[PDB]
Design a protein around this ligand. Structure first.
Ligand code: FAD
Ligand code: AMP
Ligand code: MN
Ligand code: MN
Ligand code: MN
Ligand code: MN
Lengths: 162, 161
């Protein structure tokens, strides 16, 4: 029928926000064209050869030529949530990159086919909670998310410690 | 103590999905605190003008692309005080070319604050989808810092919608 694939792209960061709050990882979510946060990717169309073939296709389109300097494999797979109402099964993948690899995506993402149409920009995910106990991750989640993207995210943070 | 933030925007001829007109590209950013806000920060002692600490904080946050244009008093829009923090927040709107803006977006990843104070830049969606909730109505649901949303919502009426 209609399968959709989206990727979390994550690179470990030794950097320290304010020089004391440790970042731990760079994680890329995108601001979509509906004003909801989510992940790179989307529909697997009819003449795609595999789930994963179709994903790397959408990463290129949404992220740019730099997304092509790696490939999400079957092995990067995490989950599949069935969207019942809009009859669509939605597959998730998490790809470990170098911070050099992940920065090359962000720097190239403004030349992406879909930059400034489907993809309004890329945002890193703040993992820290700030002293006030609310600024950071807790607030980041208060934002608006398309379909299961908040679950996907929280499962990814969970799965790998956090 | 005073703060300054800029709205940067460009005539965008583009059509989303080849029909929906984008009108203007408008830069906001995803902040270190997980809120949407505008590039800028606290002005201090040596900054001769409000515009000096502003343009200075745009250099830090948007990279050496904002060293092409300069915001001045002519761009001023509002001063909203935040009672609790005691601070007076000042707002501007700077008109650029789509090419000037693309060049900020593209450059902002080599800025001092990329992956620290600044988590990413987003274009605001000025349109509304057929469900009448997709786009701006949905966008404004997001978290924003202090008077960030009011500033946006006031500039849009004053030119952009
Ligand atoms: C001319 C034209 C007009 C269009 N008008 C509209 C419109 O008005 N409204 C509209 O919604 N779409 C519209 N689209 C289609 C749009 O480009 C999307 O492909 C479509 O809305 C469904 O995909 P998506 O935006 O949800 O994200 P896609 O990346 O295309 O993903 C497809 C599916 O995955 C889901 N999804 C998206 N991001 C995530 C994520 N991070 N995690 C999990 N699941 C995710 C979506 O809910 C959808 O079910 C239009 C397309 C064209 C060509
Ligand atoms: N976009 C914004 N609009 C208005 N006030 C803001 C905005 N971003 C931050 N602030 C506030 O202005 C001060 C300076 O913020 P900052 O730029 O993060 O140093 C803080 O007291 C914030 O509460
Ligand atoms: Mn798509
Ligand atoms: Mn997509
Ligand atoms: Mn789940
Ligand atoms: Mn600032």
């Amino acid at each position: 029928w209609r399968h959709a694939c989206h990727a979390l792209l994550y690179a470990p960061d030794p950097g320290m926000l304010f020089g004391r709050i440790p970042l731990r990882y760079a994680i890329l979510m995108q601001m979509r064209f509906d004003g909801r946060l989510g992940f790179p990717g989307g529909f697997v169309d009819t003449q795609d050869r595999s789930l994963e073939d179709g994903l790397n296709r959408e990463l290129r389109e949404e992220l740019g030529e730099a997304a092509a300097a790696f490939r999400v494999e079957r092995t990067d797979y995490r989950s599949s949530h069935v969207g019942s109402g809009p009859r669509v099964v939605a597959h998730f993948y998490a790809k470990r990159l170098t911070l050099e690899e992940l920065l090359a995506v962000e720097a190239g993402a403004t030349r992406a086919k879909d930059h400034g149409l489907e993809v309004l920009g890329l945002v890193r995910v703040p993992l820290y909670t700030l002293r006030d106990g609310v600024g950071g991750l807790p607030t980041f989640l208060e934002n608006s998310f398309i379909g299961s993207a908040r679950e996907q995210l929280l499962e990814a943070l969970q799965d790998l410690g956090l």
